[PDB]
Amino acid sequence: DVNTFLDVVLSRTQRKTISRIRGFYGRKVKFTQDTITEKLDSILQEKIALSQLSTAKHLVENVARDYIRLLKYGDSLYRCKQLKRAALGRMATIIKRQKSSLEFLEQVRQHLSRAGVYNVELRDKYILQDPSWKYDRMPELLDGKNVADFV
Amino acid sequence: LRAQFENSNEIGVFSNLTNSYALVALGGSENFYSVFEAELGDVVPVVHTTIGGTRIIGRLTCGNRKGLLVPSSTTDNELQHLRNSLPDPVKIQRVDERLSALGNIVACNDYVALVHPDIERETEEIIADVLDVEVFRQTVAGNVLTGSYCALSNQGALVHPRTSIQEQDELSSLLQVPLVAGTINRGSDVIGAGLVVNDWCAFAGLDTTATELAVCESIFKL
Amino acid sequence: ASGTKYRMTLGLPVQAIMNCADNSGAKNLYIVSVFGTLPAASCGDMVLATVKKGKPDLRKKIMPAIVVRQRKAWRRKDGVYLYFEDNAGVIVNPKGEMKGSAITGPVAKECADLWPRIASNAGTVV
Amino acid sequence: LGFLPRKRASRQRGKVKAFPKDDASKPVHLTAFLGYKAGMTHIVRDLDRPGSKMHKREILEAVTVIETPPMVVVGVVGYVETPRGLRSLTTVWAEHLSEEVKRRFYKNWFKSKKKAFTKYAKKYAESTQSINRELERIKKYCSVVRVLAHTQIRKTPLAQKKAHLMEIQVNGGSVADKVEWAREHFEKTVDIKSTFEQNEMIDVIGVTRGKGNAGYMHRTQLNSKIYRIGAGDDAKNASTDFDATEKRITPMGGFVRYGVVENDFVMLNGATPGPVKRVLTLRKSLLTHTSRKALEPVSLKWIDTASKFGHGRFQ
Amino acid sequence: MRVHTCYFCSGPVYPGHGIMFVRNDSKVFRFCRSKCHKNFKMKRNPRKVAWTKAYRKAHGKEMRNVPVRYDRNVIATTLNAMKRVSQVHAKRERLFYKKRLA
Amino acid sequence: HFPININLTENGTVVEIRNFLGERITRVIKCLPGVTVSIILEGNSLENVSQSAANIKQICNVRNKDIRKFLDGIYVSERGNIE
Amino acid sequence: PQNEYIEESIRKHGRRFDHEERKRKKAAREAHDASLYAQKTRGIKAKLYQEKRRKE
RNA sequence: AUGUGGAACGGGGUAUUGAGAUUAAGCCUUUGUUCCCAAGAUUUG
RNA sequence: UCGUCGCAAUGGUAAUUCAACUUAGUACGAGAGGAACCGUUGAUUCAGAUCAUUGGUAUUUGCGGCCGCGGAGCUAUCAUCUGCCGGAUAACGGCUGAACGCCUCUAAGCCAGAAUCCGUGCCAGAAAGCGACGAUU
RNA sequence: AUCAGAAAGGUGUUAGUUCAU
């Protein structure tokens, strides 16, 4: 689901978890937006109103990405978090766009739904007058000799 | 008779089906042998004789019902064992064929065990004598080794589709049996390797081309 | 191809000129980008090889080469490393079937076992 | 870290740190043997392994030959298990003691007066009641029984005159049954032919050969199957029934660093730690594996008796 | 198993030892030892080497592919024939030993 | 499609299941003491019967298979008193 | 196959014998599982699980 | 620390090189030869 | 006292990382493609070995004519190779069974199930562990 | 308490209170 994908993106940020931290907060938001964009691309791989909702989600993702850039500029931890929350607020708008998209996606999904150990030898099945002798070890290599060659 | 050689479909390479005694090999595909057993294997005894110590006896020995022409590399005593192991009509003698895959080289047809075009006349004569069936130099599918490239039998010596109509006829006259140009072994130039043609019934590959399997039967009137 | 994988000599090694025994119009086949790339392909293992000599289309374009024989010493049935006449790699199609009409020169029994079409191509197997 | 630290072996003769589990239902039998590695030779044996790529084919593989002369049981040791570990309650030796064992028991064979165990042998001859009481206590109280035997160092062509005596735990039967078997086998030679049927996979323990200023470390190779356990008296020990051709297992011109082997010898595929003329211990594997390789019979086809020294050309 | 004959040293070839070479004309050559292989690689004439058996024979210094029923007695009979040939070879070797001294 | 072959050994103390959805590996389950299986299993211990039934169900379980599509398996039909 | 293959197969052959019993058992165990999972919840997932429970 | 005593050579065997020489040195072995020694001290109840 | 042979408190730790074929060329699947498990073929990595096999190296620096090579021995992803065990259970899903006359992975109990862990095996051995045992100035 | 001890949730208990029948 779209919310699950957002939760997965949030989980990835949680798994990963001043100015450097600010960039990391923006990168985490950007990575979440990238994951959302990847989810949108996967939805596209899996039109009209759905494409418009996907474009609307991308626009909200761009707003979150812009807030992610603002998070990097917000060297202060509170400033970085505040812009990250703005990206989350933009992500909430993406969820609102996803809300219509998921219903279309759900309809599309509904439409789609609608032994290694074996040895053989002909010597066992020999039609020889001396088939038992054929199976028997006749002189072959007398200490590596040519006994079989002579035969 | 389509018979996939386990993962592959080279039933003929593993076993040179011969109305007297099919030249099966040690380690050859049981499913291919059993399907060959169901087709003509009762009449054509599928003795799992690894010709020259190779899992491809049909490629190694020109196993015609008149006899099997083992390669020159194969020991005479081993051939004597193999000839005795196989039925007396299908004698597995060590033909002095320069090709280690003499059965691939020599079209294992019971009527005439047509030898490879690259195989020398002495090798062809040895292939003729060892298999007791005439061995004329033939290049099936543009390949000198007609035995793997042509499903050879007394009933039918079916060539691969890569062989021309004249080339199939050339392999036909060399093996003294009709040669329908059918590319056995998944459409490859290996008709005889894919299809184990015997006089009683021309076996083929289950994973091989269906048209080639029909061509092997059509050439053999089976 | 086919045959049991083992630590044996490889006729069609990567960046090696495995002669295109199979009559595809190519005399030789150098493995610029060997299929499944010490990246090397044993006797009958179809390694994508650009024709070193012969066909220009196969030249400079990696095409499968089922090694007819392995010039390096390859373990025999007794485990004794045996060196064949040459490292010629018979040209094979992408599916593994011998692309060339007929394999020339020495074609090892491993080449015949690896590909039935190579066995068909191996007019003089050695 | 498994082999670290790398230190020289404290014992020249390999000592088995563990023995196979004994079964009361199974008959009393030995579980270990001692031999001297004479060398390694190349032999050709048919690989009768179903489902293998080279099934019903002959393969040339290395075979390690170690002389295994019959071992005379010097005595028995009674170890009683305790909460703190395995405690040796007592040990009883035979009245007659081998010279090599006595020579081995003293660091100065010539300088010694050969008085070792003289009182014990005299006491045993004078009165066997103590031995019977000791044997009864071992059969009634001791939980682990180990038989002490000395190898035939004099029979083997070894410069050392001291026997490589070692203690082997007894697996099979009850304590009284093991004690009775030890008493019957006391001061009696036990051959490896009865112990090993040459149709199973066992473990070989030995000290590696050092390589100058890495080596001299004890190792215990496993999954080793005996290919042929021949007898020195029999001339067909090194010759298979496939083509007869009776010959000696020793290479032409003598074995490398070993000479000529005249007693019973056992040949097994693969290499073992230590150089030629080195004492190695062969014992049954504690864990039983039902693999095809360990279950398929071994039948040698050709045995090469060519001159190992130099570049030999004739077998 | 077959014991091949060396191309240079003209001696028996056993498994594991020696070198086997294949030519473009489907010719198989066997070398008894590394020196024989080196001599073969150097295009050394077998009749021009004193230690070679070919030179000894051709200097005055020395004297069945048909299949049959698989019987161990036939192999034993063939082995007996080889033993008889060995006795004849020993007589030839006796001539070789004396003539080579001359 | 592929019927499952059930074999009883040691008076039903050992149950062997073969060809379970085509599986070529036979599963052997040892019945609890005091319970005999002939599938109807009777015994004097209800807990032993319940545990044996769970083990049989666990043995005849489809792994990486669609439960809704593939309905092959072993399920307890009823359980009551012998007398 | 085509259309509702699963539904067609169920109608022609039948559903699982213990499908209803397993669902009833799972439904009964749902109350115990929810409380146990919340008690054993840890890390960020604990906060998410608590938030979901609080929202519900 | 007085005997297959060992240690040395004499060798032989053995391969090497390409028949010859070195020939066990971490190739083998010695009905061959003599040498030394039924030790020299020390440690320790 | 000199020892000789054993025991193991204790630690290191071992096999490791992946596969394919067989299985079955089939459960699934309209069919094609492709089932768990079985053995095989292996690719490894690491460790254990050894120089038998293979190449060289090589103080037989030996030989034959400074070269042409070199035995022995060493060396090897340069070679030939050999190479762990069941539990406890995690995640996970249970059965039965209270609270909640039932139900309910659970609060009682019975479980199943991991390259994890513990065992197990290997390695070493408490220098300041132990036993048996010989001789005994 | 299966991390004891010296914001909250809990098929977490302990004592329970209040209200329903």
- For residue B41 the two structure tokens come to 């294997």
A9-14 CB contacts, 8 Å cutoff, 24+ apart? A9/A35, A9/A36, A11/G44, A11/G45, A14/G43, A14/G44
Contact state of C95 with B186 under an 8 Å Cβ cutoff: yes
CB atoms within 10 A of CB B7: 9
Partner D contacted by E78 (CB < 8 A): no
Full set of structural domains in chain A with CATH: 3-114 (1.20.120.1190)
- Residue spans of the domains in chain F: they are 1-83
Instruction: Write out residues 1-56 of G within 8 Å (CB-CB) of A.
Output: 3-4, 43-45, 48
Query: Quick check: D234 and D263 in contact, CB under 8 A?
Result: no
Distance B96 CA to I53 C1' (A): 32
Q: Which of B29, B30, B68, B84 to mutate to test the interface with A (most CBs of A within 10 A)?
A: B84
DSSP alpha helix (H) spans, chain E: 34-41, 53-57, 72-101
Shortest distance, CA C86 to any CA of chain E (angstroms): 9
Q: Which of D189, D190, D186 has its CA nearest to residue D124? A: D186
Looking up tokens 């030629």 gives D276
C6 to chain D: which residues are within 8 Å by CB?
53
B66: domain range?
1-222
The full DSSP string for B38-72 is IIIITTS------TTS-S-HHHHSEEETTEEEE-S
Distance D92 CA to H45 C1' (A): 28
Instruction: Using CB atoms, pick whichever of E11, E16, E79 lies closest to residue D313.
Output: E11
Nucleotide nearest to F54 (CA to C1'): I95
Distance E8 CA to I73 C1' (A): 29
Domain total of chain B: 1
Partner E contacted by D241 (CB < 8 A): no
Q: Which of F26, F4, F29 has its CA nearest to residue F12? A: F29
Q: b vs e for A108-146, b when ≥16 Cβ sit within 10 Å of the residue's Cβ?
A: eeeeeeeeeeebbbbbebbbbebbebbbebbbbbbbbbb
Q: How far apart are CA E23 and CA E19, in angstroms?
A: 13
Which residues lie closer than 8 Å to C122 by C-beta, 6 or more apart? B99, B101, B104, B105, B145, B148, C21, C68, C90, C103, C107, C111, C112
Measured CA to CA in angstroms, residue A146 lies from A143, B84, B187, D228, E75 at distances of 9, 21, 44, 23, 11
Amino acid in the structure at residue D240: T
Q: How far apart are CA D83 and CA D90, in angstroms?
A: 18
Q: How far apart are CA F57 and CA F47, in angstroms?
A: 15
Taking CA–CA distances from C3, the nearest residue in chain D reads D53
The full DSSP string for B80-119 is HHHHHHS-SSSEEEE---SSS-HHHHS---SS--PPPSSS
Q: Which residue is nearest to nucleotide I93 (CA to C1')?
A: F58
Q: How far apart are CA D81 and CA D97, in angstroms?
A: 28
**Angle between helix A2-16 and A19-45 (nearest 10):** 150
Instruction: Using CB atoms, pick whichever of G6, G14, G17 lies closest to residue F68.
Output: G6
- Say how many residues make up chain E: 102
β-bridge mates for residue B70, sequence order: B94
Shortest distance, CA C2 to any CA of chain E (angstroms): 24
Measured CA to CA in angstroms, residue B211 lies from A81, B147, C86 at distances of 70, 19, 37
Nucleotide nearest to D153 (CA to C1'): H4
Distance F67 CA to I102 C1' (A): 28
Q: What resolution (Å)? A: 3.1
Contact state of C116 with B193 under an 8 Å Cβ cutoff: yes
Measured CA to CA in angstroms, residue G11 lies from B34, G1, G8, G22 at distances of 40, 15, 5, 20
- For residue D198 the two structure tokens come to 């040459």
Nucleotides of H strand lying within 7 Å of any protein CB atom:
1-2, 4-7, 13-19, 26-29, 39
Query: Quick check: D228 and D193 in contact, CB under 8 A?
Result: no
Query: Quick check: A22 and A7 in contact, CB under 8 A?
Result: no
Which residues lie closer than 8 Å to D287 by C-beta, 6 or more apart? none
Instruction: Using CB atoms, pick whichever of A122, A131, A150 lies closest to residue B82.
Output: A122
Q: How far apart are CA A2 and CA C55, in angstroms?
A: 55
Q: Which of B162, B90, B173, B88 has its CA nearest to residue B134? A: B173
Query: Quick check: B97 and B105 in contact, CB under 8 A?
Result: yes
Distance B32 CA to I31 C1' (A): 22
Distance G6 CA to I109 C1' (A): 40
Partner G contacted by A3 (CB < 8 A): no
Query: Quick check: C3 and C110 in contact, CB under 8 A?
Result: yes
- Residue spans of the domains in chain C: they are 1-126
Instruction: Using CB atoms, pick whichever of B92, B96, B98 lies closest to residue E67.
Output: B92
| Footprint on protein of nucleic strand J, Cβ below 7 A | G 28-29, 31-32, 35-36, 38-39, 50, 53-54
Q: How far apart are CA D23 and CA D10, in angstroms?
A: 32
Contact state of B140 with C120 under an 8 Å Cβ cutoff: yes
Q: Which residue is nearest to nucleotide H4 (CA to C1')?
A: D154
Nucleotide nearest to D41 (CA to C1'): I52
Extended beta strands in chain D, E state: 32-47, 57-67, 71-82, 85-93, 144-150, 166-169, 189-190, 201-207, 218-230, 265-269, 278-284, 300-303
Question: What approach was used to elucidate this structure?
Answer: cryo-EM
Amino acid in the structure at residue G6: I
Burial class (CB in 10 A: 0-12, 13-18, 19+), D5: exposed
Partner G contacted by A107 (CB < 8 A): no
Q: b vs e for C27-43, b when ≥16 Cβ sit within 10 Å of the residue's Cβ?
A: bbbbbbebbebeebbbb
Q: How far apart are CA E69 and CA E62, in angstroms?
A: 37
Distance F21 CA to I35 C1' (A): 9
Q: Which of B200, B199, B78, B207 has its CA nearest to residue B130? A: B78
Instruction: Write out residues 52-81 of D within 8 Å (CB-CB) of E.
Output: 58, 60
Q: Which of B85, B15, D304, D228 has its CA nearest to residue E1? A: D304
- Backbone φ and ψ for D104, nearest 5 degrees, come out as -65, -35
